[PDB]
Amino acid sequence: SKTYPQSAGNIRKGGHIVIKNRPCKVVEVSTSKTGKHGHAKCHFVAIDIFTAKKLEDIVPSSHNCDVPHVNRVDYQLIDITEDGFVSLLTDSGGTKDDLKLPTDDGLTAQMRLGFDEGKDIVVSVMSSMGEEQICAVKEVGGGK
């Protein structure tokens, strides 16, 4: 549900893969084969999409990898609570309130300032495997 199975031989540089239960972006793919009659193994180098740590795997080309779904969604900012939660407006007219201000000080200052200023602030959220990160902030209008 958070992942789908795909043969290692179909994984490409720039795609994603699960290594040690971590969603990673594939930065290097190479293959090796045992002699003339072997079956290729895929050697992956990948970068954890939240922690930026490098992880690696060697997988037979014919075995499945778990591939994580990775989404990027924009929301309008409708609140920053005094305890650091963020309230986001959903495309169905709902609210998404489970996220906090990002650890990035630039992104947080942009959100807080834009909100204090009465600006229309759009927040990009990257999500994978039940984990979410505010990854961009822009103003699109408004003001006081």
* 47 and 79, same domain (yes or no): no
Distances (CA, A) of 42 to 30, 38, 55, 104: 6, 13, 14, 35
Resolution (Å) of this entry = 2.3
Using CA atoms, how far apart are residues 85 and 141, in angstroms rounded to an integer? Answer: 23
* 74 and 142, same domain (yes or no): yes
* 96 and 143, same domain (yes or no): yes
Which CATH number characterizes residue 106's domain?
2.40.50.140
* 44 and 83, same domain (yes or no): no
| CB contact at 8 A, 36 and 18 | no
* 56 and 74, same domain (yes or no): no
* 76 and 95, same domain (yes or no): yes
Distances (CA, A) of 124 to 3, 38, 40, 42, 54: 21, 45, 39, 33, 24
Host domain of residue 142: 70-144
Mark 31-59 as b/e (b = at least 16 C-beta within 10 Å): eeeeeeeeeebbebbbbebbeeeebebeb
* 55 and 102, same domain (yes or no): no
- The DSSP secondary structure of 60-115, one letter per residue, reads ETTSEEEEE--EEEEEEEEEE-TTSBEEEE-TTS-EE---B--S-HHHHHHHHHHH
> Which of these three, 15, 39, 69, is where a domain ends?
69
Q: What is the 3-state secondary structure (H, E, C) of 45-68?
A: EEEECCCCCEEEEEEECCCEEEEE
